[model samples]
Target: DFVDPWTVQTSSAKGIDYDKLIVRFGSSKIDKELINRIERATGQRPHRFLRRGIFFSHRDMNQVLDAYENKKPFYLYTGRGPSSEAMHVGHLIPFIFTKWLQDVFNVPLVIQMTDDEKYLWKDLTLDQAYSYAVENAKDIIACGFDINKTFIFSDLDYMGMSSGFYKNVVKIQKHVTFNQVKGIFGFTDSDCIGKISFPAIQAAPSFSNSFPQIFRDRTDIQCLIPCAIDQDPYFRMTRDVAPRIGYPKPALLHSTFFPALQGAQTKMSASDPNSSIFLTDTAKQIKTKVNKHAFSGGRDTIEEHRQFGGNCDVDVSFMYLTFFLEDDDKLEQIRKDYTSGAMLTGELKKALIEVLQPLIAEHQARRKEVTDEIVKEFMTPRKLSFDF
Candidate 1:
């Protein structure tokens, strides 16, 4: 069922250290050397944020950048399955990165909130699933997506709006056999029919036909997806079906999973409130969570820690800073101090709290301004004003 050897490795390397797992799974490390190579290849300095390692691992990013440089059409796509009422800090990673990409490229962006998928996967009633989708939409819009250039729609809402979206979804379903999905997604026979059939809905947006109104009858446009590697199985299935379905295969820029506050062994989940720092958390809550729960790779004592460097690999605060902090010099300073034992866990957590509290506060302020009408406008499908 898998086309690439790395896909097998990625799928098999569950519950391992995320960094080691990614290397084993065949993603290039997002280090300074890789950034330099990207800059040389593109003839533009790697985005400032990338140099800071905020947008870490990638796949076929060169191809995506090349397409942009040559004036070829490529749209951005990312998704969320609304399984919870509020999104965690880990949940905002893709949106934050995707928003930067959209601004830099000025491309039309499509955000899919899979309310149907959530209902199929979670313990929620259908009504609850739909409400979660709307609630999650407010949080996503708070990330500052432009209403004019971005389309954010739930699968439950948009599955009925355009015949084209449904057509593409059906085309995918016809090509991807049940056994293929089972092997790729680990779906068992006991799984619901909706769970079996849902991958197609996620894959459909990768094709231009999924949004006929926005593309303006252009079915040749490709898509670039920025998502966590866990979702790669869905797109791997999509890539296989794309040509057969008469659509261009999507270029993916995959990210490592944002680990739970407990450790890198598990992904951040909304179901467990303490497992992650939510965007809705107050400053005090964020501070308390980091101090109490954020995993530290530091030593048992200051003397022991100073003799042996801190383990940055599994440190929750360090990992989060790598994603959010934009200043390379400052990030390096913190890393050096922490690893050298000059910085205690409390000090590291204070830095993180300082960075996140204001960011979340500003996001909340912005979200308060997004009315229902504004949400509707952003979700509407319309042709983007682009001159060929």
Candidate 2:
């Protein structure tokens, strides 16, 4: 597969090569030393996400932890693009990890929904995209973030309400040239003006001081963003423009792409719902998708499979389970059985269906409780119960 991090592609034969990506993307490896620091400082076992390498790379993360050790202030920033009616399980990775980071650091957190940007890039109209933002917000809220510390907003709703946010967007736009923006985002003369200006909008929240209503103009604080690695390009460009604008550059923790149901060569697509398990999928749909679409590693025949076993390395079932399955022992047992051909492809899919159906059901139940009023409470800007 071609190795463009923004638009990741890989073969069913090989998953992402993090070793090469580390050097290629010029980010630090999340090695044992950093993991030890996180474990010791938090006085807890690293979240299963970290222990399992769901978040595989980072930038200035050691420095972020160092600031934590010294008790200096920093806030966490992450976002959901909210492009579809329902986001797949892949959409939850950064939010799940970001929530853990928030709990560990006891810091202010901001989650952005790029509704307007989605409109500019996707085929949706303003109202449709904004509606998607609100729907997806419920899903994110069900991820268990604290209302006292967390703020989630849609650009369509929030931008018009805050002058300070607009000010920061202008600040970022001035420093970034058309040439530079074109280079980072692949913009061209034919692209709409909205697309040209949208990066600045996405870049504004990283300044942390932009939300005067929430932070009360706190310029001393820095920002830490945990997002999928495909998003690193926007931030990479932002880092280049930050100090020039008299603001701190945002630090990042980049996660690897979530592989598709078909295989590892491509990430799941919202356009193709069959390639992913949407949060709203029923038990039957989840089972059907896994059995029909999940790529297999078993041999062509039962006799051959029993003799030679399956390849866990490229098996879609094992890959998806690694991200979802928290019990280390049970996951290892699945690996052993599957690798030895004791587990058939159908059996492996059944195991995945068992793991996923309940998990998705739990999410659906929690999401149902997130009322519109509750969503408004989180999206509204107010002082968090913390030193600003």
Candidate 3:
């Protein structure tokens, strides 16, 4: 198994060994007690992601709960890397969960668009990178974030525009040694300086003071980050430097990898048109992709399939349903039927297509309403609904 910000690989058909990953990353598991605590604290049912164990790991979450219990303020932080103008359905996982958190906690939110990081990491021009950020921000905005409570920013613009942001970035850069970055990110001497210093930019937002306009330059407010497990390495580095720089360590909740349509061995990629369903894909295209590419675990022949049953463990269609289908009883029924050979591969694929088609359509409808002006409003650096 190999897991990093840019890649996820595992030999097991079931995807990355998250139990092993929890131990390797040295983060706490989101157990039954934690899930119950969240439900009790918010006085609302835990998000489906929490109940289903999709978001199964965390760092410093207990403290965030403590602050909430005591009526102390905290905020939400999550980010997007705008490498592609068309984001895949898998991309929505974090934003969807984060929105639920914001709604329940009723706190401020800051979403970082790491366009500069994409420019440094990918073969894209600076202008192309920034433009992608704007387009991707529209997709994020369509996730139904509240304008009054949310602040979204692009690194290329925000880093240059906000003094507090840049100050925290420089402070992080000064404290983290070159050797530490190398050890953490597996960077070599041949890597560009921009790549080497980029983690500091990502780290800066964890400090509340980085957004002086939003938080009134206060450094005491803690941030809870909802992100994929691949991103933990950056936060690990950030957490290490946080206390030394006199800022509280940002908390995190890590979600499992969203598998590609073909299988769980790799994550969905934009370059591959059929690897996963994109938010921009038409209903016809979605149907074609699921029918043709989504991996199946049924037997070779219909007769054999009915006799032997299917393996839900590695079936991509069933896995997608686990994430998208919100009805718990319905999901369990499908699982039993599929595993018992009562459902065929085609039927399972049809069920997934049914779920995804409407979801993508609704997202597209909301995204259509997000004009460039709306994007600008969300991207603007300004005060949120809270006072310091």
Candidate 4:
């Protein structure tokens, strides 16, 4: 098999270096070689996220891309489990990438905000969990999902209204034994029954039955999920069980974890506002956060840094560029200058500040436009009138 060189690890215990992991997992790094290959392969420039590295990592994406070229129908599915009222920048990666995908493919998208899973896993009361769902939905909607073509729904709300959705959930639950769930999700004896059973809720949407209105009468259709690798265990179990349940196995594109502001060893958590740049942050806040808190891989002194050069592997600005920059020439130029010690960390952070501040501001504006009525329209169960 032609596997990615960066991802061919021998043991799970080696853990993951997200940067290398993404390249290994099949994300086209926007280097000159990758860009040229994509141009030749697709006969078109890649989407901005792919060109930039914002959309990194994939599983069997070449097949998906091939299907797109043939004008085949394949819908996009990505999710969020609303553990908090506010989402950090890391949470926006999949949505941003998925939005680009929907635009490029011109396909209907299903954005699942797992309120039930949040309720089961968090300390929140049921109502609080539901409220978090609504809040998170607004943020996701703000990402520019088309109400006419996208379905944003909460598990708690949809589970009650659709028997089809629940039936799929039940089928998944029946196929996955308790032991498997425990191994995949790190479930403990002390965990609640609801928490133990929550993986099925997440898996349910992978099947077409979860949204009869959009995918009504299309159980043969397959789903493609773009999510972080931490969530892979859930889908691994879902894929293992899909055959027995009579549904096409869901294909996944998994991204490496977004590193905490402090370092790559830990993942960015929404609970710590300082650990990530939140979508709600203002221009000044963005500047302050990146300049003050974001870790840099530059040397301590100007002389030392200039002589020793920056380390692109660990530099926060370089890491972000791998996610946000789309131009191969420009990205490589920066990598060369920064790694050779021509660019300073402050200068690199400034570039990120400029890129993200406007994006967050635009997102906030879009979110303001997503009123309760609009949410209802997107969430309503109805046939999407697609060929699938």
Candidate 5:
């Protein structure tokens, strides 16, 4: 297993080594006590994802719960960098989980699109990056976020929308020494100046005041960012600077990486369509992709598999089912059946194919309805239906 803020590498069939990651990332594991506290405060059960360890780690989550217990306000913040025009299914993981967090807390959320980050890092035209940002917004909007409670923005345009956003960025830039940026981000002298200064832009949204139209330049409000563990480096630096700048360090809930279809050793990539099931993939496409690419934990021969049984730990099909198949009883049954050699590899793959085919199809149907106007509506700077 491999871990870092930028990339995760693991040939692990059981997925990334999360126990080591909790220490490596300097975050606490989410335990049953925390889930009980959440339910006590909200009078609702935690999402299935939380119970199943899909979202397994946290930084300052107890503080967020404490504030919620005291009836204080906090907003959700999570986002994507537009590396490609079309997002693979792995890209949806954060937004989908973040949406549940918003619904459970009934709080406002501000989504930051790091279009500028991709532009600085990739040899991409500014126009290309800008267009991808808007296109990607449609996919995110299709996730069913309440427009009245969520405000999504792209740095290219939103930076010009208000001065406070840039003001926070500058304040962060001044406090962040070049050596500090170099240590945290691994930036060198040869790297562009844009890349060196860009972490501040991403960090600025930690303060509610950055969004004058949304938060009305309020500095007292807090933010909770539900993101993958790979993004923790930015927030680690952000948290360090927050107190110095008189702003609250953003609280975070970190999810593990979505394993590649081939195996859990490497993270999925956008360039390789076969690495994951894209939102646009058809039923046949999903079937073909999963059947062919999803790593197997079964024996080489049918007779051998029935006699020896399958190792659910190494099987990609079982892994996918653990994430996509929500029913606890049903998932446990599959695990029992498969590991006992009662279920064959083909059968397990078929089960996963069935679950994903419809899920992706429904998303495609919704995404088709996300028009340019709808995208604009979500991205427009406006007040969410909540008070700071």
Candidate 6:
């Protein structure tokens, strides 16, 4: 198994061992007690991601909860790379969960569009990278973020426009040694300086003072990030430097990698059409992709399938439903039937197909309504709902 910000691979068909990953990452597991505590605090049930253990690990969530109990507010921080024009359903994991966090917590949220990072890493021009950020913002907007509390900014624009943001980046860069950066991110002399310096850019958003407009120039506001576990390395470094730089360490809710349609052996590759169903895919395309490409855990023959039962742990369709399907009881029933061989691979694929087609179409419909004007409002530097 190999898991990093840029790569996720495992020989096991069931995917990366998340329990082991929590140990390796040195982050706390999100046990049942935490879930109940969140329920008690928020006066709401935990999101399905938390309940399903899709977001299985966390860092400093207890502190965030403590702050909440004391009526102390903390903003949310989550982001995208803007490397692709169309995002797959898997890419929505963080945003969907983050949306729930924002709604429940009623805190200011900042979404970083890492266009500059994409420009430095991918074979894309600066303009192309920035353009993707604009395009992706519409899709993010369609996720139903409240404009009054949400601020979305591209790194290329925000870093240049916000002096505080640049100041925080430099502070982070200054505190983190070159060897430390190299060790955490596996950077070498062969890599570009832009790549080496990019961790600081990602780290900047964690500090509320970086966004004066949103945080009202306050340096004390805490931040909670909902992101994939691959992003842990960057935050791991950030958590180290945060206190030395006189800012509180940002809390995190680490979600498991969203497996590709092919299998959990690897994460979805946006460049690969067959590996995921993109948000732009038509209903017919969604159905075809699920039936043809989604890896099945059923036996080779019907007789054997009924005799041995299916493996939900390794089934890509079941994995997708865990993230998409909202109801716990329905999901569990599907799991039980699938495991008992009462539900076949084709039936499971059909269930997934039904869930995704309408979800994607609804998203596309919402995306259609997100004009350039709406994108501008979200990206603009402005004060959020709460004053720091």
Query: lDDT per model, in order?
Result: 0.78, 0.85, 0.92, 0.73, 0.87, 0.92
- Worst ten in a row by lDDT for model 2: 1-10
Residue 311 in candidate 2, Cα distance off native in Å: 0.7
Over 1-388, each residue of candidate 1 has an lDDT whose tens digit, in order, gives 1222122222321233446645654654567866666566446556654765446666666667677667787889998888777788777878887887777677889999899998887888878998888888888898988887889888888888886899888889999988998888878899899999998999999988788788755678869998777677788788889889777778776665666787766667776677878888898998898899988888877788888868776698888887777687998999999888888887888898899888889988988998989887877767666543
lDDT of 6 by residue, 226-296 (tens): 99999999999999999999999999999998898889999987977778789999999988889998999
Task: Name the TM-score of candidate 3.
Answer: 0.98
lDDT tens string, model 5, 90-187? Answer: 78778998888888888998889899999988879888898888888888888999989998899999999986899999999989998998888788
**Candidate 4 local accuracy as lDDT?**
0.73
The alpha-carbon deviation from the true structure for residue 2 of candidate 6, after best TM-score superposition, in angstroms, is 1.2
Tell me how far the alpha carbon of residue 191 in candidate 3 is from the true structure, in angstroms, after superposition. Answer: 0.3
Q: How displaced is residue 66 in candidate 5, in Å?
A: 0.9
Q: What is the model-wide C-alpha lDDT for candidate 1? A: 0.78
Q: After superposition, how far is residue 224 of candidate 2 from its true place, in Å?
A: 1.0
Task: For candidate 2, report its TM-score.
Answer: 0.96
Decide which is better by lDDT, 4 or 5.
Answer: 5
Flag regions of model 2 displaced more than 4 Å: 1-6
Q: What's the CA RMSD for each of the models?
A: 3.8, 1.5, 0.9, 4.7, 1.3, 0.9
Weakest lDDT window of 10 consecutive positions for candidate 3: 267-276
lDDT head-to-head 5 vs 6, winner: 6
Minimum summed lDDT over a 10-residue window in model 4 is located at 1-10
TM-score for candidate 4: 0.87
- Candidate 6 achieves a global lDDT of 0.92
lDDT (tens digit, per residue) of candidate 2 on 177-258: 8898787777798989888888888788898778887777776677899988888778888888898988778899988777
lDDT of 6 at 30: 96
